[PDB]
Amino acid sequence: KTVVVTTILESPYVMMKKNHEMLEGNERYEGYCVDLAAEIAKHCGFKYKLTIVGDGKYGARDADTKIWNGMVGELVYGKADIAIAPLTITLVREEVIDFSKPFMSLGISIMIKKPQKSKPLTVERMVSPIESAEDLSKQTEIAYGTLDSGSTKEFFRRSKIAVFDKMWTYMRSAEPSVFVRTTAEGVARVRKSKGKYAYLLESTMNEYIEQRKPCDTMKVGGNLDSKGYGIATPKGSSLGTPVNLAVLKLSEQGVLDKLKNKWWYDKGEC
Amino acid sequence: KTVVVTTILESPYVMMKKNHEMLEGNERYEGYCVDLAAEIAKHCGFKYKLTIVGDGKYGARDADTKIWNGMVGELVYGKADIAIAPLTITLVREEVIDFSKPFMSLGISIMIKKVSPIESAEDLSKQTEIAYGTLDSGSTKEFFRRSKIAVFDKMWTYMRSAEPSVFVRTTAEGVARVRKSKGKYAYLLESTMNEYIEQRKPCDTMKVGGNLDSKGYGIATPKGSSLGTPVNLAVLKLSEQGVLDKLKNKWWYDKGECGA
Amino acid sequence: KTVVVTTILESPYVMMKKNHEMLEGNERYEGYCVDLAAEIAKHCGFKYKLTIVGDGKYGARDADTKIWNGMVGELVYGKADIAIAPLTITLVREEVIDFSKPFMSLGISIMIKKVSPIESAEDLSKQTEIAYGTLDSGSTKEFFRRSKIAVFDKMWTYMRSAEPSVFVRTTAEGVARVRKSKGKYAYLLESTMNEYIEQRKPCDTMKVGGNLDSKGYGIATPKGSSLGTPVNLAVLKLSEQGVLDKLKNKWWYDKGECGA
Amino acid sequence: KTVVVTTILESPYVMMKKNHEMLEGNERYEGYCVDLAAEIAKHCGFKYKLTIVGDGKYGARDADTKIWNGMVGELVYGKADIAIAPLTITLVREEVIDFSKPFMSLGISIMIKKPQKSKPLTVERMVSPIESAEDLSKQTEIAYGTLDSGSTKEFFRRSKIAVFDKMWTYMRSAEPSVFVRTTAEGVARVRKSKGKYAYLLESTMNEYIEQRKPCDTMKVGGNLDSKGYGIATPKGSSLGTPVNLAVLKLSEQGVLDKLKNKWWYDKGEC
């Protein structure tokens, strides 16, 4: 019996092939996550068919209803059996599903439009309004926001640190709304905001976008915390230990580093 | 009922209190792992007695005996209940004990006594003039042992067939040896350990290049134990809250006894 | 009894003189191959009639049909007696035809339009901005297909899985494309051919990096023939006497129609 | 029936290891040729026993006796059946044995003591007295000679080039004798001659000596000839074609380049 692997349409984890109007099956998508699924199936024998969640959300908890949605939400309800997707490992998700050991290090970073080149002897220097989260919280002339129903929204929602509390208090009463449904929408907002917008996203997508054309955006500051990407699995499933072992095996041989280099730096430019 | 805890004497993870002859119990130990164990006990609600394994090795498998030494051995043979210590998560140990979610990211890093013609691992393997070594019975010598890369295989062959034995019993002795070797030694060790060593006086050692790979530190637990899930939840909540980052800064960058 | 000699129209190995329409016989052909064949005919003592293959292919195996094309095909199938031409010695040809000792060393070279940003082959493979290709139905392509190195395999996938077809029927058209690509095309070809192209006007191409591997040009003879040993002896005598070096200098650097 | 492998004790092809007094069998010798023979026997299955010729000569034909000595000499008479050694391919040699395709590229180079660095603005440069062989022929104050009963001496004997004829004319009447018995003897004469002597040898050993400590010698000029090292085999033997195919395979997979790099450049003491 074949199992369904749920994934989110995000780059460079899963991208649409140029020739995909006629292709069918698992050959429709390319990226990091499809390679990870291929290696998982090579380490342990099973037939997998990738799918994309209709909602398109990573997964969070709704208010006053306590119903899980998104990738995690449909993984709890049994319509999916494994989520090989860039899903962060969180305490709220750890109490409802089983998470394998992280296969990708990440952190909340700062995304800003690349500032222009200051002419002043003829050397070329780079300056940026934002160099840390503290100064972004202090300043107000540049707006900032996160991705709706993601992991960073939950991180700022339940943070007792003073600076993160200030950022969250600014975010909840932001007029107009600052959150974005997709990473691409937030990136486009940074692109067309004339430097009047800061994006809070995971470091992996941030560096991939920085090293991709037209590369007019760059990351400043530092990682606000340390988290990881894990392979989801429903509670009481016979796949958690094999997938955990497979991730450990891939880490030991170094396949994960090879895929990261191939899909992050090998296709870079500028 | 009390809980038996096993750890190792490694800095800045577990150290000995300056005034420890006049103190008894758990008050004579301080460091990252001691505070971590205190918070884990607070979140779970159990009394724990911190102990140090009589053998000062982390744990491995000896030559053709199928016996676990170090902390993992005390964990599998009923001598221990939980090990909050710098125990790297690897495949081989995942089949004998339970690993919680990692609480400290790390990677294999090089360090030399202060042009730097040691830029990364490629030329270091290609340069046999200066020797190098790893910790015996740890997670690094085994990492080199079962690596399928050609460069890492060459490094393993050069490490095993070297006169004299470049392996060192304890990382402190290896640090001393590389400090007294006048640049004729590069020590392979974890990123956190190397950063802590290079961040203290006399600051005559530096980390160069980047990590050879990425790994983490896990709170080990005997297989099929009722404490694995509670400690995993405790690590998750401490990482979400940010206390782990606070302890990392407190025991790595707070004393600041050097200029960098 | 005359001897059929096969070859290809490749510069500077074979030239069609300058007024070939006014000449007939083997007197209308000049170049390294023509003079070399003259010397072999003088040493062995046989009359030969130089011919050009109908389809100017060096030799390859087609799509799972077990058919030899080009000069090697004309040799195995009885259409030719001996090949004096730039025929690289490789594994597959040795099993179907007899090779003499190499009379010209060679290697895989990188050619670009006029510090190079690529130089080494690994650097060229890592950068996908500049496309590259090989000569179809030759030895370079086959060398790339059977290469087991990761870099060379990724190269082979790069030229094979590219849009449009980077492969070119003749090395002359590839050289023209490189000169017309404004530095966006690197052509992979033999060191001798690349050096000859560079040495000629308008001197808008240069050779960067080293030679990827070790090959040579052999004089092809069909399997189990009586002319393999005499031709090998003639090649050895010419190499010892130094006529090969003089011919290479005369047809590669004697003209010197460039500033260097 | 095990096949006897005849070789010559020359570096870096065959060198004695530090722990060789107690070792026995093929493990006594380590170097380029020994692992080349190992790969040859791995490609085509046979059992090989390593041996070293008692005479220690590469091989040549004496005058008025028509008796072949050295490695080729003992190979012709039948006491050996294959030779994985740095043996050059020559017309006189191939007339009696069946060589294989050249597994190494070689030429005749010039060996000279490395001159001192010239003081004069503070840039440090180096100069050589005689770069090309022509200058060595015109010059007389620095002596030069080949290796006795080798390929270089044979080539100079039968050379028709004017400069090479002049060099041979000088060598044949050298007082005292200029030819050296072993490559090590020629190198030592170069070191102890204070720059008064020049050595003629194949480029491979010249490169090895240049890149080996204390690296007081260097090679000037280009490559006078262009020859190669082939695997010897008695005329009419059945091992010729398997050896040729194995050499071609090793060249094609890149093994030969790996051995050259790991026995010539990898131990870069200088």
Ligand SMILES: NS(=O)(=O)c1cc2c(cc1Cl)N[C@H]([C@H]1C[C@H]3C=C[C@@H]1C3)NS2(=O)=O
């Ligand atoms: N270089 S990277 O961010 O793609 C990356 C990140 C990580 C990797 C492997 C790679 Cl390649 N493995 C580790 C895993 C290995 C074992 C120890 C920690 C987890 C379990 N997690 S990680 O530290 O999140």
Ligand SMILES: NS(=O)(=O)c1cc2c(cc1Cl)N[C@H]([C@H]1C[C@H]3C=C[C@@H]1C3)NS2(=O)=O
């Ligand atoms: N900054 S650090 O090295 O002290 C550090 C490193 C890490 C932390 C927390 C901290 Cl504070 N948590 C993560 C864990 C949290 C959840 C997401 C990945 C694992 C499960 N592992 S980690 O990426 O190895």
Ligand SMILES: NS(=O)(=O)c1cc2c(cc1Cl)N[C@H]([C@H]1C[C@H]3C=C[C@@H]1C3)NS2(=O)=O
């Ligand atoms: N200088 S060159 O490229 O024209 C050149 C190259 C070579 C020549 C002769 C010349 Cl002139 N002969 C050798 C052959 C001669 C004998 C020794 C090696 C083979 C058999 N092959 S080679 O090393 O490929």
Ligand SMILES: NS(=O)(=O)c1cc2c(cc1Cl)N[C@H]([C@H]1C[C@H]3C=C[C@@H]1C3)NS2(=O)=O
């Ligand atoms: N890199 S090198 O000079 O040691 C070198 C040089 C050469 C090698 C192998 C090596 Cl390792 N093999 C080739 C051989 C392969 C086939 C084609 C030419 C001969 C037969 N000759 S070569 O071009 O003279």
Ligand SMILES: N[C@@H](CCC(=O)O)C(=O)O
């Ligand atoms: N990848 C994150 C959400 C994306 C983001 O943080 O921008 C998650 O798994 O929740």
Ligand SMILES: N[C@@H](CCC(=O)O)C(=O)O
């Ligand atoms: N964290 C390692 C330490 C040993 C090493 O650094 O090699 C272990 O537990 O084995």
Ligand SMILES: N[C@@H](CCC(=O)O)C(=O)O
């Ligand atoms: N002349 C080569 C082919 C040309 C090329 O590969 O560029 C041969 O003998 O096969």
Ligand SMILES: N[C@@H](CCC(=O)O)C(=O)O
């Ligand atoms: N190797 C040469 C002899 C000269 C030398 O080794 O320097 C030969 O095969 O004859």
